[PDB]
């Protein structure tokens, strides 16, 4: 079993952009706001050696009883 | 079993863009807001060696009883 | 079993765009809003070696009882 | 068993666009809104070596009892 | 068993467009809205080596009992 990653040269720009500005933005409103959940996740790889790997794992969240 | 990844040269720009501005934006409203769940996830790979891998895994979320 | 990925040169721009601005945008409304779930997921690969891999897996979500 | 992917040169622009602006947009309305589920998923590959792979898998979601 | 993918040169623009603006847009209405499910999925491949692969798999969703 032989796994070989051998890059030569190259230009790599890794620029993921997440803009979350004013996620909660009511304008001129009247009322009540209860149980607001914001989950913002950014994950990634620039090149790299990662067999049998997992980027992001999320479970059991954002529940109201 | 032989796995070989050998890139030579090249220009790679990795620019995923997520815009979440004003996700919750009521304008001039009256009422009540309960149990708001926002799940924002960005994941990726620029090149890389990752056999038998998983990008993003999500389960058991956003439930109201 | 021989697997070989050997790219030479080339120009690759990876630019997926997700625009989620004002996802929830009532204008001049009256009422009640309960159990709003927004799932926004962006995932991908620019090049890369990933046999037997999975991009995104989601299960058991957005349920109201 | 021999699998060979060897691209030479070329110009590749990967630009999938998802516009989700004002997904929920009632204008001048009166009422009640309950159990709104929005699932927005964008996934893809620019080039890459991925035999026996799966892009996106989703099950068991958006149910009301 | 020999599988060979060797593209030379070429110009490839991958631009799938999904417009989901104002998916839910009642105008000047009165009533009640319950159990609204919107599933928006965009998936694809620009080039790439992927025998025995699956783009998108979805099951067991959008059910009301």
Residue numbers in the entry:
A (entry chain E), B (entry chain C), C (entry chain A), D (entry chain B), E (entry chain D): 69 to 133
What did the original publication write about this model?
Cryo-EM analysis revealed that S17R37 formed a major polymorph, termed S17R37C, representing 70% of usable particles, and a minor polymorph, termed S17R37N, representing 20% of usable particles. S17R37C and S17R37N were both determined to resolutions of 2.4 Å. Additionally, two S17R37C protofilaments form a symmetric double helix fibril polymorph in 10% of usable particles. The S17R37C polymorph core spans the residues Y69-Q132, encompassing a longer core region than that in the S17R4C amyloid. S17R37C contains six β-strands, with residual weak electron densities observed, likely corresponding to an unidentified peptide on the N-terminal region (red arrow). The S17R37C backbone adopts an S-shaped fold centered around a long β-strand spanning the region K102-Q114. Similar to the S17R4C amyloid, a fuzzy coat was observed on the N-terminal side of the S17R37C polymorph (red arrow), although its electron density was weaker than that in S17R4C amyloid. This result suggests that the N-terminal region in S17R37C amyloid is more dynamic and/or less compact than that in S17R4C fibrils. Additionally, the residues spanning N105-Q132 in S17R37C form inter-layer hydrogen bonds. Perhaps most importantly, the PrD-C core regions of the S17R4C and S17R37C fibrils either partially overlap or border on the Ssa1/Sis1-binding site (T143-K164), respectively, which explains the previously observed resistance to chaperone-mediated fragmentation.
